[PDB]
Ligand binder design. Structure first.
Ligand SMILES: O[C@H]1CCCN(c2ncnc3[nH]ccc23)C1
Length: 167
């Protein structure tokens, strides 16, 4: 039993809710919140911009030190950093950004990072401003993640469409 509330159950391990991931994180304080990161951990817009703003830019400061030490992530890769005031940990995961021409096949590799954590709050990778089909992203999530994932879907029209079209 965990403290996630109001989610629709999609499968054995995947749950979905129309919710602002920032407001969700601030309520649940999950062990892991997933950020829709880029390889540079530049948290400028989309989910990443929102999560960083909620940390008063502490996420960005920590991220810049991470990059200065380690260099960029790989597309499809991840790193674990602090969750600041939102969660214990933030798993920064890089899905391919279609608006940069990156290979959508790397979306499965990106979701594989979730399997290293027993429970997560997460967005649909590569959705929104990353330019991928959110229905496809949800499918890859369901077919790749085996741990317990709670998906926060910001856009109401998409949440209802995601539910109504789910197979
Ligand atoms: O355009 C959308 C694409 C998918 C990721 N995304 C989000 N998902 C959940 N909660 C959120 N809060 C602020 C942004 C956001 C933005």
């Amino acid at each position: 039993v965990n403290s996630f509330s109001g989610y629709l159950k999609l499968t054995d391990n995947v749950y979905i809710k129309n919710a602002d991931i920032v407001e969700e994180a601030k309520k649940v304080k999950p062990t892991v919140v997933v950020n829709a990161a880029n390889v540079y951990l530049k948290h400028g817009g989309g989910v990443a911009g929102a999560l960083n703003k909620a940390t008063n830019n502490a996420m960005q400061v920590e991220s810049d030190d991470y990059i200065a030490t380690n260099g960029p992530l790989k597309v499809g890769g991840s790193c674990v950093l602090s969750g600041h005031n939102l969660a214990k940990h933030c798993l920064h995961v890089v899905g391919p950004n279609v608006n940069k021409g990156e290979d959508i096949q790397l979306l499965k590799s990106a979701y594989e990072n979730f399997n290293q954590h027993e429970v997560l709050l997460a967005p649909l990778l590569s959705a929104g401003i990353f330019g991928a089909d959110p229905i496809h992203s949800l499918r890859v999530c369901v077919d790749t993640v085996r741990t317990n994932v709670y998906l926060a879907v910001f856009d109401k029209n998409l949440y209802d469409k995601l539910v109504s079209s789910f197979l």
